[PDB]
Design a protein around this ligand. Structure first.
Ligand SMILES: C[C@@H](O)c1ccc(-c2ccccc2F)cc1
Ligand SMILES: C[C@H](O)c1ccc(-c2ccccc2F)cc1
Lengths: 197, 207
């Protein structure tokens, strides 16, 4: 049966409990002097609650929020690039933060996102999750959960609705899901949402 | 009490026939086990080349995974497959491996065709069936290194200094492999394997 942990349980393990999946933490800086492949660093992998927290504390203590960086947590064997076989037919639920929310909501929202991933918070639809990405940017931070198949409406919408609930966002505040094939095309200031919740 | 299966029993479960009525029809294993894959691609970090394939905790789920990997795959040199108890990384620096070692068998090039598949399977059955009595708790896992010069199969154990456990595991393993008494197997501590000190690594024990 699926290994599922709620928020209370994961927090109680913080200072081994196996995860349903093994996960890989990646770092990317968009340094145009280097190829995208050189810019992409695997930091670490883990598959227990306790090893997640040890890595979290180490990255949080030893940390940077340099704009232009990205951190990504993805299931083992999935590259954090939309061209991966497990991402190319998929998309993302995107949370856009305003500049003030860098100080108030970024750390909390990112952590809540990470807990939804490792705790398998979306029931059978947790299998559709590929990973999550935070883009640290001067103009506004972005957090997203990447899923494998943009045509799996039931899976995608369940993920969005639960994610929204776990973030504690007001029902007024709507989140969009965008297919990666649409995000990849620059067609103006906005990318169309395939779904909203 | 420990869940122990002999070879005959495990082989009799090979077959998807099971209905698994009530989710209670499969034979539980004493431990949950994780199958890992590693390619030593020097363009990537060691972390990037180590992949978790799957985990299982019944006899029937072992066989479904075995059949799938056996049908869908062959053996590239430079690859390693490892089966380890859940929560032990197949790296000697893991807390459960750093004070331990391995019982090693090395197969020559011809034995890729004749003995590799059989020996690897017999190794896997010793692990999942808890074939070493209370000393099965000292087992961490097993590793096959597929190599052009000669393949290696090993059972990794947790603690060097547990002489009685280590030697019992070795004797039983050698018996389960059906090796001639002439053919000796060595146990090497991982701290000694890690240091390259010449053509050989010292054996702490031999059976
Ligand atoms: C932005 C900075 O505070 C940060 C970024 C990533 C992690 C992290 C650590 C372990 C596993 C997944 C993660 F995303 C932690 C902290
Ligand atoms: C490809 C090679 O012949 C191979 C490698 C690993 C297994 C395996 C299957 C199930 C559980 C653990 C395993 F190591 C079987 C075959």
């Amino acid at each position: 049966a699926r290994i599922i942990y709620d928020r209370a349980f994961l927090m109680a393990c913080r200072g081994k409990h196996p995860l349903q999946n093994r996960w890989a933490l990646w770092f990317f800086k968009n340094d145009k002097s280097k190829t995208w492949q050189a810019n992409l660093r695997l930091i670490s992998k883990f598959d227990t609650v306790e090893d997640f927290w040890a890595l979290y504390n180490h990255i949080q203590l030893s940390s940077n929020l340099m704009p232009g960086c990205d951190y990504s947590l993805f299931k083992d064997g999935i590259e954090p690039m939309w061209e991966d076989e497990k991402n190319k037919r998929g998309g993302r639920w995107l949370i856009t933060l305003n500049k003030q929310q860098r100080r108030s909501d970024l750390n909390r929202f990112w952590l809540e996102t990470l807990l939804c991933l490792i705790g398998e918070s979306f029931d059978d639809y947790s299998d559709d999750v590929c990973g999550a990405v935070v883009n640290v940017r001067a103009k506004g931070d972005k957090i997203a959960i990447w899923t494998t198949e943009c045509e799996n409406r039931e899976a995608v919408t369940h993920i969005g609705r639960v994610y929204k609930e776990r973030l504690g966002l007001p029902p007024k505040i709507v989140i969009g899901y965008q297919s990666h094939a649409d995000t990849a095309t620059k067609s103006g200031s906005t990318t169309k949402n395939r779904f909203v919740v």
